[PDB]
């Protein structure tokens, strides 16, 4: 035998990414998982460096970041890279989800469920990093997200006070944010390995939705060079964002330190969250609002159950495709509404967008699938 | 023949796993309180006169 197959560690590597049988015909939409992994690695490295200069204390956090960006050699670009890498991470994440919704890869149940877990974990992590600078937006974001558990009817307020460690947001809460933000990424790493373990038991779905076991090619050299090309492209975009236009996504209100006595007139979270914010804004009831907020993501878990089609992929299903793109526009609409004041036109538009989101996932797609079946005479 | 204590104990309580578990939770509820009280009594008694509870 070759050494490639002489040994358990080596043979696992070989079954993973040398002699793995991959479909010949998968497209660019399948590159975004490797880019996700790359992004995780980038974040961990840049974070370990930042960590050695940051101060988890409310009387010096802000100024520690000032110190990083002004006195540490090239510290400014390390900061820039961390912040922009998070944004890239979520871009890839959203595109990665959407692929699977379009091409019917949710029928790999274990992979799909571990994906949902990973989405949740990544969001938690990103939010707990966003409050560390202790600027004016960070503070009130913390406040809202930790008051969320007050909606639990019997035990909520006590949960809030047990997470605060006191009567209010304060120094004891910031160290908790920092410990959790430190530890979560590694749990994410382990669960990613489990995710891929589950994947390699079946292999990759493909655009046509039919079995590809007659035309499998090896992962090396084809997809090795293909993914390397994808990585080169991602690095070009990331560099241009870091050096040529660093302030594109930046928010001025987080360059004012925290003031516990004043909330600013215009409130806006980080962009990858706006849509949830809009959903949360759309229900005139506290408990109902929070419930909707969490269901908006948890609803992905029952898509496999509502599947009626005989065919797996939307490639050959046009009515389906039309609905898919309408759903994507509803999400764009929620993102846009999240940016606007809480005033009447936007209130009404947001409520319609929310009802149409759930409607579409839960009702319209199942019924169009049945119509489609009937048109093909089965 | 001889209805003996451990046999009744097996047949009523321990034969079925759910009931075994229930027996265990019920026993711990009462053991905890009895055991605490005994220990606190002994402790208090070893060093009477030196604890601020009574000096108060």
């Amino acid at each position: 035998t070759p050494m490639r197959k002489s040994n358990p560690i080596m043979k696992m590597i070989n079954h993973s990414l040398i002699d793995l049988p991959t479909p010949s015909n998968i497209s660019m939409w399948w590159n975004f998982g490797s880019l996700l992994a790359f992004c995780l690695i980038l974040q961990i490295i840049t974070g370990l460096f930042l960590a050695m200069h940051y101060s988890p204390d409310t009387s010096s956090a802000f100024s520690s970041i000032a110190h990083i960006t002004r006195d540490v050699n090239h510290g400014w670009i390390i900061r820039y890279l961390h912040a922009n890498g998070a944004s890239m991470f979520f871009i890839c994440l959203f595109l990665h989800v959407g692929r699977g919704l379009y091409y019917g890869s949710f029928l790999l149940l274990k992979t799909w469920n571990t994906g949902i877990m990973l989405l949740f974990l990544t969001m938690a992590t990103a939010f707990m990093g966003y409050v560390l600078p202790w600027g004016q937006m960070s503070f009130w974001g913390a406040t809202v997200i930790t008051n969320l558990l007050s909606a639990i009817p019997y035990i909520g307020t006590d949960l809030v006070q047990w997470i605060w460690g006191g009567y209010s947001i304060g120094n004891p809460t910031l160290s908790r944010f920092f410990t959790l933000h430190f530890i979560l990424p590694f749990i994410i790493t382990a669960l990613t390995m489990v995710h891929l373990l589950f994947l390699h038991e079946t292999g990759s779905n493909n655009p046509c939705g039919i079995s590809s076991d007659s035309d499998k090619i090896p992962f090396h050299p084809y997809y090795t060079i293909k993914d390397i090309l994808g990585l080169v492209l991602l690095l070009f975009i990331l560099t241009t964002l870091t050096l040529l236009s660093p302030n594109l996504l930046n928010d001025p209100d987080n360059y004012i330190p925290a003031d516990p006595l004043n909330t600013p007139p215009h409130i806006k979270p980080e962009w990858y969250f706006l849509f949830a914010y809009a959903i949360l804004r759309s229900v005139p009831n506290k408990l109902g609002g929070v419930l909707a907020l969490f269901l908006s993501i948890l609803i992905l878990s029952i898509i496999p159950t509502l599947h009626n089609s005989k065919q797996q992929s939307m490639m050959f299903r046009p009515l389906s495709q039309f609905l898919f793109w309408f759903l994507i526009t509803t999400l764009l609409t929620l993102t846009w509404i999240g940016s606007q004041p809480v005033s009447q036109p936007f209130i009404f538009i947001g409520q319609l967008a929310s009802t149409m989101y759930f409607t579409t996932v839960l009702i319209l797609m199942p019924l169009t699938s049945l119509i489609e079946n009937n048109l093909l005479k089965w | 023949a001889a209805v003996a204590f451990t046999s009744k104990l097996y047949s009523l309580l321990f034969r079925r796993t759910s009931t075994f578990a229930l027996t265990i939770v019920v026993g711990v509820l009462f053991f905890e309180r009895a055991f605490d009280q005994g220990a606190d009594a002994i402790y208090d008694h070893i060093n009477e006169g030196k604890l601020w509870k009574h000096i108060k």
């Binding site: 008051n147 005139p284 009831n285 | 026993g27």
Partner: protein
């Protein structure tokens, strides 16, 4: 069989006791420490607060509003129909002197600080998710479930009030 199973039972009971104690003390590590729990009172001098002015003071880590209401506000807050409220309450259930009102400046929805003299009702407006309050601190529009909270106080001088 009975005897052998009795031994296991007893062992399990002891293990449960030990586990409960360990886990609970670990959990009580994360509750408020013995240097965070101070509770002081606060004294406010009222002759520095003009008519129509809302002042905010820091108290027990959170804002405390003191509002010096004008006559038309005292009049129009009384007109309100209590049947059209989600947390019904009359103004005189909420003040000790009509021209002063004292509140805890925290929004009952998710904790943001209402801005004063804003919204549809002349009271306060919360930017975070859009709840409106009236000059009695009553919730009038938006997702919040309750009225703004009133602390215990008392007047020690016609120009001094103590909140505790």
């Amino acid at each position: 069989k009975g005897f052998s199973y009795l031994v296991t039972a007893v062992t399990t009971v002891g293990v449960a006791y030990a586990a409960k104690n360990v886990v609970t003390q670990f959990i009580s590590s994360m509750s408020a420490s013995a240097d965070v729990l101070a509770m002081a009172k606060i004294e406010i001098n009222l002759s520095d607060i003009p008519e129509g002015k809302n002042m905010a003071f820091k108290w027990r880590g959170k804002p405390l509003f003191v509002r010096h209401r004008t006559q038309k506000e005292i009049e129009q807050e009384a007109a309100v129909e209590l049947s059209q409220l989600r947390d019904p309450q009359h103004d005189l259930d909420r003040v000790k002197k009509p021209e002063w009102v004292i509140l805890i400046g925290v929004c009952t929805h998710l904790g943001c600080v209402p801005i004063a003299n804003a919204g549809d009702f002349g009271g306060y407006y919360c930017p975070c998710h859009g709840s409106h309050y009236d000059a009695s601190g009553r919730i009038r529009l938006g997702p919040a479930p309750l009225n703004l909270e009133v602390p215990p106080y008392e007047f020690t001088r016609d120009d001094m009030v103590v909140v505790g």
